[PDB]
Coordinates of C-alpha atoms and ligand atoms in Angstrom, one line a residue:
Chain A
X9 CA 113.5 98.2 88.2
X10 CA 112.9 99.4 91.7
X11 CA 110.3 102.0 90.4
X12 CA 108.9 103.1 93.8
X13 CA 113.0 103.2 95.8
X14 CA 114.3 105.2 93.3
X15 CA 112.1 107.3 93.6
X16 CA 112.0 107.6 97.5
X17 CA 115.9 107.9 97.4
X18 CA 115.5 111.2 94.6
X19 CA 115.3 113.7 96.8
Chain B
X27 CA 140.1 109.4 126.4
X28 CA 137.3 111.5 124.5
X29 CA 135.1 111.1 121.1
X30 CA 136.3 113.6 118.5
X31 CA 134.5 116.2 116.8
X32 CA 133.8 114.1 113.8
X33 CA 132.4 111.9 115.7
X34 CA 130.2 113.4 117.7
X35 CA 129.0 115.1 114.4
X36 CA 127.9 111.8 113.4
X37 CA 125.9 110.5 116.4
X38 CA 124.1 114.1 116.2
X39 CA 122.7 113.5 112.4
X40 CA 122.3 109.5 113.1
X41 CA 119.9 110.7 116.2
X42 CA 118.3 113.9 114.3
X43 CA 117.5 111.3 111.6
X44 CA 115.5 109.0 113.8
X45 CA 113.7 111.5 115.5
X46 CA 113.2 112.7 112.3
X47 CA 111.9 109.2 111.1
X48 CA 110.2 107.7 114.4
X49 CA 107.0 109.0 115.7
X50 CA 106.6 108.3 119.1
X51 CA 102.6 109.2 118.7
X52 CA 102.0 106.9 116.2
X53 CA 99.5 108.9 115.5
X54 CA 100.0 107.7 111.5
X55 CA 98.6 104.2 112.2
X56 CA 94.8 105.5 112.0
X57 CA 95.7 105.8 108.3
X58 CA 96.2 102.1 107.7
X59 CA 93.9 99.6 107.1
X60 CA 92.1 98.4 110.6
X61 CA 93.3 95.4 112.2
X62 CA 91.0 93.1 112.7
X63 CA 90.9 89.8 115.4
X64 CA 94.8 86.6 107.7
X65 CA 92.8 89.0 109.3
X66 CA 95.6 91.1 110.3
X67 CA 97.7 90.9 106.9
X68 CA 96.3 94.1 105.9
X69 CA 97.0 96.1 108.7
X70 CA 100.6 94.8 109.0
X71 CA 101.4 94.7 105.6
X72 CA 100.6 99.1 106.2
X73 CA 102.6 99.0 109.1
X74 CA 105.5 97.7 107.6
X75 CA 105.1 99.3 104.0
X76 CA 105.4 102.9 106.1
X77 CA 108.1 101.6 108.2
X78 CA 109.6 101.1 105.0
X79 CA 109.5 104.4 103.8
X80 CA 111.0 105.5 107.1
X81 CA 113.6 103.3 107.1
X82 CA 114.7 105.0 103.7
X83 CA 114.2 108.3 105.1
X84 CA 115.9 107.3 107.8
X85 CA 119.1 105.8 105.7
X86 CA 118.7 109.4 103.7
X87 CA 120.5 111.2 106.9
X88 CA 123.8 108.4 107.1
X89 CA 126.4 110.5 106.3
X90 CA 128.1 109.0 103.7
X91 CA 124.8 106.6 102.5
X92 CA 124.0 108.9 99.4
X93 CA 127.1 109.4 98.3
X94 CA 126.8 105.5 97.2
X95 CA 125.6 104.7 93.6
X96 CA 122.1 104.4 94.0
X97 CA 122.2 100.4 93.0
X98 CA 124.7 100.3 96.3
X99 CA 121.6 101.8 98.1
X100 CA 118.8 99.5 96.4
X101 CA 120.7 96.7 97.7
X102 CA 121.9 97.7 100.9
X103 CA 117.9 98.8 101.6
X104 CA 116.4 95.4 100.0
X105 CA 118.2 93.2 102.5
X106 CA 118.7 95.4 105.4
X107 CA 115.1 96.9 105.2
X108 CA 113.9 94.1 107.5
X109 CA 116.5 94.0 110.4
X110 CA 115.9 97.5 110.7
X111 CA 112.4 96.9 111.1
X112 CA 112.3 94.6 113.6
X113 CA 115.7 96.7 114.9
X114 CA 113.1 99.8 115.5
X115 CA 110.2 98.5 116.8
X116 CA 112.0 97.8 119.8
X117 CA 111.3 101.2 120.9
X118 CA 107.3 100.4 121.2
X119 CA 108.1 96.6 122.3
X120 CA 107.6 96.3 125.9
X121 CA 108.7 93.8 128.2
X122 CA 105.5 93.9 130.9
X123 CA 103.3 93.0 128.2
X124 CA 105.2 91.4 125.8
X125 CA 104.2 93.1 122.8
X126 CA 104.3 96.0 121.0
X127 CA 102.5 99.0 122.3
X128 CA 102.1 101.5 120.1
X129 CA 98.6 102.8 120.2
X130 CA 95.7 102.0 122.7
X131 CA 94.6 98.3 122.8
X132 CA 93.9 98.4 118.5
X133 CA 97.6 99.2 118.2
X134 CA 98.9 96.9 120.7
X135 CA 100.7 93.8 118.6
X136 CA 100.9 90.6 120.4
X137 CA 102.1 87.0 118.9
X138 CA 98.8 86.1 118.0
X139 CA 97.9 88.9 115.8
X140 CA 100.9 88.6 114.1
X141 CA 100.0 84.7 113.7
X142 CA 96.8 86.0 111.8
X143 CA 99.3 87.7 109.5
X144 CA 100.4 84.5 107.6
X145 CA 103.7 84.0 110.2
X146 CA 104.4 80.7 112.8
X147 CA 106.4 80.5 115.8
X148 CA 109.3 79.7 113.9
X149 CA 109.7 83.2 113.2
X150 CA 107.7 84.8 116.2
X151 CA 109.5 83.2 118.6
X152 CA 112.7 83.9 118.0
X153 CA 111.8 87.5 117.4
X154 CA 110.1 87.9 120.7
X155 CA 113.0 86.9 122.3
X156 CA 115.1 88.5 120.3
X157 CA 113.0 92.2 121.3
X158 CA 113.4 90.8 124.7
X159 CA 117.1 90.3 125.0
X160 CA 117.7 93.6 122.9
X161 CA 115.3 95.4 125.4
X162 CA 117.3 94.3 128.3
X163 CA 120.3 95.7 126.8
X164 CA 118.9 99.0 127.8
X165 CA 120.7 100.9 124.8
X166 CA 121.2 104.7 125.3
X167 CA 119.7 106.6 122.5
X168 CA 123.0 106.8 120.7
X169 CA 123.8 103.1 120.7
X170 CA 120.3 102.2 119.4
X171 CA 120.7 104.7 116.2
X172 CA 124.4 103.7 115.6
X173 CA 123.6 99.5 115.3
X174 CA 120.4 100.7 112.8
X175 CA 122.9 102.4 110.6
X176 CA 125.8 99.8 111.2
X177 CA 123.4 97.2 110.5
X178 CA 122.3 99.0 107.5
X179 CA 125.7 99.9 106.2
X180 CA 126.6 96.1 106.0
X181 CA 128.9 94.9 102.7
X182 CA 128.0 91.6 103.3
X183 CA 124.8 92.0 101.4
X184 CA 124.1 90.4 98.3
X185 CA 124.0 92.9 95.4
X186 CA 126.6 95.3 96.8
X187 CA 129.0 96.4 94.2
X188 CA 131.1 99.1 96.0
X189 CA 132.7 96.7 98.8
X190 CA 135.8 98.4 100.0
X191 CA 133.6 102.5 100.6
X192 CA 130.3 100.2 102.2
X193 CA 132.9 98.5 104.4
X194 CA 134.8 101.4 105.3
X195 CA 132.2 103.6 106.4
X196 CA 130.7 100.7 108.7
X197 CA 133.5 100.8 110.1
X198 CA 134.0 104.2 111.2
X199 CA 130.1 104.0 112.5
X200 CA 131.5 101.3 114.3
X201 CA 134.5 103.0 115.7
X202 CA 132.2 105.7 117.0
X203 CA 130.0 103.4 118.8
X204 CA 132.4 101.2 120.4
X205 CA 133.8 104.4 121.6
X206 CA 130.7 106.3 122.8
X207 CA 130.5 103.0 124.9
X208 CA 133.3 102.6 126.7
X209 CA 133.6 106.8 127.4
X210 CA 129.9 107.3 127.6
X211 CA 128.1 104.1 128.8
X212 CA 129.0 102.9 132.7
X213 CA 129.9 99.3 132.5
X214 CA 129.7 98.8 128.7
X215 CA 132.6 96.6 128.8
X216 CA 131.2 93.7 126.7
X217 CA 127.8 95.6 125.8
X218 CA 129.4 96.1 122.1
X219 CA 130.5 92.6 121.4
X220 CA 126.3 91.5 122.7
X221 CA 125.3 94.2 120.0
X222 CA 127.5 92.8 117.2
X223 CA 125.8 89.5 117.8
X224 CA 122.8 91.6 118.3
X225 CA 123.1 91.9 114.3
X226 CA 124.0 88.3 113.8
X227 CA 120.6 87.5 115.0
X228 CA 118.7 89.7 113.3
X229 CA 120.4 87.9 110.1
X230 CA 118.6 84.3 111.4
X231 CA 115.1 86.4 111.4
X232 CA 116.0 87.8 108.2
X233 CA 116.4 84.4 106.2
X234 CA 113.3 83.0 108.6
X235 CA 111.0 85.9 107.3
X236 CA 112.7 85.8 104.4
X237 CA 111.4 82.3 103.4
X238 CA 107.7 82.6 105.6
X239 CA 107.4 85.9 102.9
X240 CA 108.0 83.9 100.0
X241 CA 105.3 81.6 101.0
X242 CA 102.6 83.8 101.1
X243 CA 103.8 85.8 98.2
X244 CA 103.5 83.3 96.3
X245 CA 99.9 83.1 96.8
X246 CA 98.2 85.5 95.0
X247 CA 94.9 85.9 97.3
X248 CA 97.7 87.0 100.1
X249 CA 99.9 88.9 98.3
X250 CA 97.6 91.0 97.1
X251 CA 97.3 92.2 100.5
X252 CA 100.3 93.4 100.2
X253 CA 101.9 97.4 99.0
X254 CA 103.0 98.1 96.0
X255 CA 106.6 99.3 98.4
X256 CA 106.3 96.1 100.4
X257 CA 106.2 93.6 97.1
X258 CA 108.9 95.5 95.5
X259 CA 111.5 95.8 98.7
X260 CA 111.1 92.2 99.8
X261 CA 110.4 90.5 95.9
X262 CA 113.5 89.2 94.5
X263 CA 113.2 91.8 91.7
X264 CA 116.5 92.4 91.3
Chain C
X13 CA 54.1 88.0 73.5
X14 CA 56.1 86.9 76.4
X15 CA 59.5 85.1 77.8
X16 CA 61.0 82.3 77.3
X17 CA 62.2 80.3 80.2
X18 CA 65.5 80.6 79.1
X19 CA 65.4 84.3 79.3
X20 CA 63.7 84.4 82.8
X21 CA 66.7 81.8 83.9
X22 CA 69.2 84.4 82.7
X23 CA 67.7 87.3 84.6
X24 CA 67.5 85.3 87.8
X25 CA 70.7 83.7 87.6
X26 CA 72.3 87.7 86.6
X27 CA 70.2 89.4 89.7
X28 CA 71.0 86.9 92.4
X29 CA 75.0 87.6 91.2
X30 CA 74.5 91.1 91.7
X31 CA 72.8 90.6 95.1
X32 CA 75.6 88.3 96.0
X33 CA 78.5 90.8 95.0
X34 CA 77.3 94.0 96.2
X35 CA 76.5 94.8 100.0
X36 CA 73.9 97.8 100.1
X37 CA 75.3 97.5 104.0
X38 CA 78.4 99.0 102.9
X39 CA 80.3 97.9 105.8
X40 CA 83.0 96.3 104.4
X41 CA 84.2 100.0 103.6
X42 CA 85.2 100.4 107.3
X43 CA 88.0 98.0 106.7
X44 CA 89.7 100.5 104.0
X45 CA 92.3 102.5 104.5
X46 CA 90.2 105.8 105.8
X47 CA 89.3 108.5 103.9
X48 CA 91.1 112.0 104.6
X49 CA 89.8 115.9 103.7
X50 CA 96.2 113.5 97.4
X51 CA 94.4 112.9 100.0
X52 CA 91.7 110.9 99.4
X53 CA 93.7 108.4 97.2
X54 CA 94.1 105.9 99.6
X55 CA 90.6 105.1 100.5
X56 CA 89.3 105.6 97.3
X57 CA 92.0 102.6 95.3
X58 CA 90.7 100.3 98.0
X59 CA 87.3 101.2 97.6
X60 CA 88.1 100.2 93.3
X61 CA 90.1 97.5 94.5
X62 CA 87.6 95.9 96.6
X63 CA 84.7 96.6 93.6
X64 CA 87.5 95.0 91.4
X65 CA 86.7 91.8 93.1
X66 CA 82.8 92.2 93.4
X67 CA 82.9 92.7 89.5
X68 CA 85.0 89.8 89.0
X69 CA 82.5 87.6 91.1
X70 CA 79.7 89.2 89.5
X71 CA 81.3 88.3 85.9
X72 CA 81.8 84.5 87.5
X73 CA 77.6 84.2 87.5
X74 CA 77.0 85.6 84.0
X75 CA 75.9 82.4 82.5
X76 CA 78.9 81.6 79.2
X77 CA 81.1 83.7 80.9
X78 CA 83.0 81.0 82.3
X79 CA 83.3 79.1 79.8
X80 CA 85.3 81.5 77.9
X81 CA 89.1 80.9 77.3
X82 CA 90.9 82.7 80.5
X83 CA 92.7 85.0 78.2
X84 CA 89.3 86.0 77.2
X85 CA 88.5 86.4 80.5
X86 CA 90.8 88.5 81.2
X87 CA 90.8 91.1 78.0
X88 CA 86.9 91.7 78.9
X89 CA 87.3 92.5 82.6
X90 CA 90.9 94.5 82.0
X91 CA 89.4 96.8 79.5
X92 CA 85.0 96.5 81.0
X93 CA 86.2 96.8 85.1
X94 CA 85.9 100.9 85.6
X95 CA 83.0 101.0 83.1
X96 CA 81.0 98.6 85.5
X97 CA 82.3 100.3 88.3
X98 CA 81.1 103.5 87.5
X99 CA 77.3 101.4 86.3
X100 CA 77.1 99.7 89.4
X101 CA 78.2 102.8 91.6
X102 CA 74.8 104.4 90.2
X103 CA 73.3 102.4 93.4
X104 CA 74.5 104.4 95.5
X105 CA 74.3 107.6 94.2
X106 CA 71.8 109.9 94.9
X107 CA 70.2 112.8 93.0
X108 CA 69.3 114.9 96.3
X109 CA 72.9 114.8 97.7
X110 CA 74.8 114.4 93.8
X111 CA 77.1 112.2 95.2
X112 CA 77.2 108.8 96.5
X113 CA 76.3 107.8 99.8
X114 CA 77.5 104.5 101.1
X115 CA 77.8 104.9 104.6
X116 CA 77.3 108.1 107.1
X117 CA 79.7 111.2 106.0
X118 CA 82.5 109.2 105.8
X119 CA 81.9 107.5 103.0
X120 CA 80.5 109.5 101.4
X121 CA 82.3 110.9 97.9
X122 CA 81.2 114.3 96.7
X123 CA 83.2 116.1 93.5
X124 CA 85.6 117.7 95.6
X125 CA 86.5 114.6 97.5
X126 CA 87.6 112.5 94.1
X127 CA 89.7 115.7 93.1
X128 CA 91.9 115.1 96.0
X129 CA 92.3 112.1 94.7
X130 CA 94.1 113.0 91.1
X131 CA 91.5 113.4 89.1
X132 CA 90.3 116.8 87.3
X133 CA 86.7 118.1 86.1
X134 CA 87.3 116.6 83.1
X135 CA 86.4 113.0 84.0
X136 CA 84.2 114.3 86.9
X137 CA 81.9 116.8 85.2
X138 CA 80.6 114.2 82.7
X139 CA 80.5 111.3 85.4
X140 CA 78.8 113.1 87.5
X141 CA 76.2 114.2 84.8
X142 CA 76.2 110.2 83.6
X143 CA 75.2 109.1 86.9
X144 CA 72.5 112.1 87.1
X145 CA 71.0 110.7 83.6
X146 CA 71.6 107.0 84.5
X147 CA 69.6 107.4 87.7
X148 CA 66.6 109.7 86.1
X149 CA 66.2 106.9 84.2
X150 CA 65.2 104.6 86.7
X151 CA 66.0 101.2 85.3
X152 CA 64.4 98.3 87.3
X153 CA 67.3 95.8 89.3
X154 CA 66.4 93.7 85.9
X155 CA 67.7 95.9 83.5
X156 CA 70.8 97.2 85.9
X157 CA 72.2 94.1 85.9
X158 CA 71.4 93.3 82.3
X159 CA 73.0 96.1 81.2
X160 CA 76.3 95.3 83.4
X161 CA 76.4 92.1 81.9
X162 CA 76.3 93.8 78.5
X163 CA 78.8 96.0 79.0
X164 CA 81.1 93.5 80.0
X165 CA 80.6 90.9 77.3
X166 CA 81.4 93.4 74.6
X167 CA 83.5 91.8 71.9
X168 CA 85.1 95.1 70.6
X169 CA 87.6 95.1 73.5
X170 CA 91.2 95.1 73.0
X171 CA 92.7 91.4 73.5
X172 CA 89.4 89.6 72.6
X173 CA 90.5 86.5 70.7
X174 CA 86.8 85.0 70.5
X175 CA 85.0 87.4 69.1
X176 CA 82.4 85.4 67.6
X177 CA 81.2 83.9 70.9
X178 CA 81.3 87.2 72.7
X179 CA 79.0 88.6 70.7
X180 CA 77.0 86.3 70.6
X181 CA 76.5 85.9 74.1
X182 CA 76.1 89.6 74.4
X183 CA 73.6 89.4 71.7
X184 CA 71.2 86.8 73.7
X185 CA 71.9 89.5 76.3
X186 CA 70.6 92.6 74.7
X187 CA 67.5 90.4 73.3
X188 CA 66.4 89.5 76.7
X189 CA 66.6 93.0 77.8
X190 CA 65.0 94.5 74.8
X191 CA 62.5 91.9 75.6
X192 CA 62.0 92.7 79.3
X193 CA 61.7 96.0 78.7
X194 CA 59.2 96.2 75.9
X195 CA 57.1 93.4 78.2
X196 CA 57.8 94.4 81.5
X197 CA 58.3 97.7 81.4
X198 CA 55.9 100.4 81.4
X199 CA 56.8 103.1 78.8
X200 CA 59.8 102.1 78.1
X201 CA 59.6 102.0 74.4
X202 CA 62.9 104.6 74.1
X203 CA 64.1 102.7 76.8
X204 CA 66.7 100.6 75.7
X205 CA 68.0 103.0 72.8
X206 CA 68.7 105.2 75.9
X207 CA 70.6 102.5 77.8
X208 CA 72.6 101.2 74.5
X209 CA 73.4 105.4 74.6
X210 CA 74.9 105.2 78.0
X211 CA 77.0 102.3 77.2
X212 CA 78.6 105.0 74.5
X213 CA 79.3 107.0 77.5
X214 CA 80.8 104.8 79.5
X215 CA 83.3 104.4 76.4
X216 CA 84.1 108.1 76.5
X217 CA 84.1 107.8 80.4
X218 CA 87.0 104.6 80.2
X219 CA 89.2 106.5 78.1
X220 CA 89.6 110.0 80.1
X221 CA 90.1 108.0 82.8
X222 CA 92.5 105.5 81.2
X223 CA 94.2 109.4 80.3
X224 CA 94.1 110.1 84.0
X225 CA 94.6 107.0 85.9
X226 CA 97.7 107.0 83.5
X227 CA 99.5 110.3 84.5
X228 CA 98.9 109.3 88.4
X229 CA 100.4 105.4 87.8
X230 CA 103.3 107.1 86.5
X231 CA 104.2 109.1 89.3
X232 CA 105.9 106.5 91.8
X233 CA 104.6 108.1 94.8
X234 CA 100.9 108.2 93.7
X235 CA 101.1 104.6 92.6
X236 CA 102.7 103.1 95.5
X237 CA 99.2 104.1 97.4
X238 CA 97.3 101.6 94.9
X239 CA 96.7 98.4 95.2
X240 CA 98.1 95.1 93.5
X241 CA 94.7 94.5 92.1
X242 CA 94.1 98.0 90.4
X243 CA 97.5 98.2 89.3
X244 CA 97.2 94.4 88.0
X245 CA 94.2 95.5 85.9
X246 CA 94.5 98.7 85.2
X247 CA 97.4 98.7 83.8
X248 CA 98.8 98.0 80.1
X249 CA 100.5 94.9 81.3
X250 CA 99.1 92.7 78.5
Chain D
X2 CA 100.7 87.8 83.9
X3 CA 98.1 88.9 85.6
X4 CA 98.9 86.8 88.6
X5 CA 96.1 88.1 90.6
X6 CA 93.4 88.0 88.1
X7 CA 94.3 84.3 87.3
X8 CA 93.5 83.0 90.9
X9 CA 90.2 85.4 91.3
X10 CA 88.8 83.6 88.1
X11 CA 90.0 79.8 89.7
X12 CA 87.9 78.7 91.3
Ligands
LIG308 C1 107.3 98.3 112.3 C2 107.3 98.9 113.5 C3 106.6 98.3 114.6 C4 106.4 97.0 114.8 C5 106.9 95.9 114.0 C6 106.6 94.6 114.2 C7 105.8 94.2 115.4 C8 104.6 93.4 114.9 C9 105.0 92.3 113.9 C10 105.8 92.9 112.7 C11 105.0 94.0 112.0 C12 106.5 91.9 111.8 C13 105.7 90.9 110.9 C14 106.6 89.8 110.4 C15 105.0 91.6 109.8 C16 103.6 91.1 109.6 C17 103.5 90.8 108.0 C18 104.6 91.6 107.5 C19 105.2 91.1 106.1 C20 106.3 91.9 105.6 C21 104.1 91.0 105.1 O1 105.7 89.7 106.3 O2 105.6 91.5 108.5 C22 107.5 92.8 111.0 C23 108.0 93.7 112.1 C24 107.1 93.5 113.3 C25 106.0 99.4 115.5 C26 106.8 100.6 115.7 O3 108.0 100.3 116.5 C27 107.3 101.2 114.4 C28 108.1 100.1 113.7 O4 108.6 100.6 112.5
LIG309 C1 83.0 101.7 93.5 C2 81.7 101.9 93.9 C3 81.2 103.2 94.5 C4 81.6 104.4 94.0 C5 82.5 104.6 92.9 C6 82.8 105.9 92.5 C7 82.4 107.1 93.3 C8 83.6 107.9 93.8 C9 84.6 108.1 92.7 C10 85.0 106.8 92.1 C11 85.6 105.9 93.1 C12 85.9 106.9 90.8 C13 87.3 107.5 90.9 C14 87.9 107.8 89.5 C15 88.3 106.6 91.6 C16 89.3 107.4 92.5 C17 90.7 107.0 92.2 C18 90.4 105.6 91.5 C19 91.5 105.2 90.5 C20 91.2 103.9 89.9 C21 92.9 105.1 91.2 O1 91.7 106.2 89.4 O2 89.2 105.9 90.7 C22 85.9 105.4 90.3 C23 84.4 105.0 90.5 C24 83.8 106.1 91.4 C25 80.3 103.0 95.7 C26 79.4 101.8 95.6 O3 78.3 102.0 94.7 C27 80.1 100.5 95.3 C28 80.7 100.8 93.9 O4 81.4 99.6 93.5

């Protein structure tokens, strides 16, 4: 879930 | 008396991180798709998709905000991403033309484009007015910054699991603010308490958008106007 | 001997769908996200999203298209969409330039410009030489959109529950078009082995770019610059 | 599934 956030938030 | 060290040290990184985050040039917006006079639900639906990732950029410089679990993140950005939307763009809204000025005329964002995006008055209205009453607050630099994070940092968000460490550090951005105020900011004597409630209208919009957003992502030949970051910030994914 | 009126129906009723899905203007492509010299990403997903939707409008006139089940529907344009893409993008190629030219240098793509777009000289080299044998062969608008509508209403996709019907529609297909040819056609009697041959390619064509398209959908911030609709069908969703 | 593709087939 929340592929693209993750993402954004790592770095 | 004065604002301590630590404090100060926290109004420097909230302000590094929006000018880090905020491009007074706009000079990004030639990347989205054109506006055109739902002819403008493309356009807007770029707009807000990179606001998006600058509200998260943004959030990355809170001290404190990546020390939460990234769940406590997800949900603090999926419910707060919109306040802090409309929260920014005050800083290209402008009271002699009522409207957002960001570029030349293409980039300029009155009611009735945003009308063309799938939005009524219900929503517009209240948010004009909202931009207008926040715009005559005439926030220092420092205030504006320090509500964005307050309002982000909010534990009254549905989702949050860490309660108690959201809470507290909302309220030590809030102990800084109301303190740069009264030391900082000449006659600021009840400008806090209008910025609090400030926030509390920016939940009204929230729920307002909230539902007109649900109604046109519900239909298929809209939302697939839509980003991929837009659909799955403001979708109740969970 | 000659056609039937049945056949003659067909090809009329398959041209005028192509005519009415595809805009040799080009000037819808203003109203994509611009291109940039992954740079290029942007305007190139919209420029597949928005032939996404010509190809599903163009499927919508094939006569017996329609009346297949949805789900059937759905398999043949899912697994058929970049294969007709890359067929129908042949109209705008050109052999002087080896690239296609759509609008003034804007738009348009050379090799270089779908690199930056996450794609490597292993799907470019042999589309590029595809569309260089495609257009030497210098099919008549008759036998472009015939073979489109072949390509599509092949029954050995993935998903296809009604096989028998598929076929057999694609069957009357290929006979009218092995028909126009051999009638219509001057010297075309290698013809339509040689188009039948470029349908193989097209196979070969799908599946490096199903390789490729996959490695770039599965990188979050490449695929939150596609669209719903490419994401929708191009991905394994099932 | 395939939301999108649903509606652009009806009508
Ligand atoms: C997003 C920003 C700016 C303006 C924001 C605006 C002014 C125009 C109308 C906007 C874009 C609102 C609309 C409700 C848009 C249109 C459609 C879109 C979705 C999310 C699809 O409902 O929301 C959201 C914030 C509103 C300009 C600038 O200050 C940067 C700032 O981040
Ligand atoms: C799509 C069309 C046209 C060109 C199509 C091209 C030429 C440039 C390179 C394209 C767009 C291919 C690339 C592999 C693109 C770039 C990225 C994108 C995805 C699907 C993200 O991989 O595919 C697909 C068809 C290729 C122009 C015109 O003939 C209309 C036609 O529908």
């Amino acid at each position: 879930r929340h592929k693209i956030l993750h993402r954004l938030l790592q770095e | 008396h004065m604002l301590s060290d630590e404090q100060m040290q926290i109004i420097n990184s909230l302000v590094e991180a929006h000018h880090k985050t905020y491009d007074d040039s706009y000079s990004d917006f030639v990347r989205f798709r054109p506006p055109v006079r739902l002819s403008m639900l493309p356009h807007l639906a770029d707009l807000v998709s990179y606001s998006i990732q600058k509200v998260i950029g943004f959030a990355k410089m809170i001290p404190g905000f990546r020390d939460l679990t990234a769940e406590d993140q997800i949900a603090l950005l999926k419910s707060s991403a919109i306040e802090i939307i409309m929260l920014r763009s005050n800083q290209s809204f402008s009271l002699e033309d009522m409207s957002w000025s960001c570029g030349g005329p293409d980039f300029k964002y009155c009611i009735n484009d945003v009308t063309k995006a799938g939005h009524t008055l219900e929503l517009l209205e209240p948010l004009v007015k909202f931009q207008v009453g926040l715009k005559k607050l005439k926030l220092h630099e420092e205030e504006h910054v320090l509500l964005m994070a307050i309002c982000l940092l909010s534990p009254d968000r549905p989702g949050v699991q860490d309660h108690v460490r959201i809470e507290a550090l909302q309220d030590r951005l809030c102990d800084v603010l109301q303190a740069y105020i009264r030391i900082q900011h000449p006659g600021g004597r009840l400008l806090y308490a209008k910025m609090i409630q400030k926030l509390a209208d920016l939940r009204s919009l929230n729920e307002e958008h909230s539902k007109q957003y649900r109604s046109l992502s519900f239909q298929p030949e809209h939302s697939m106007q839509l980003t991929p970051l837009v659909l799955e910030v403001f979708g109740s994914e969970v």
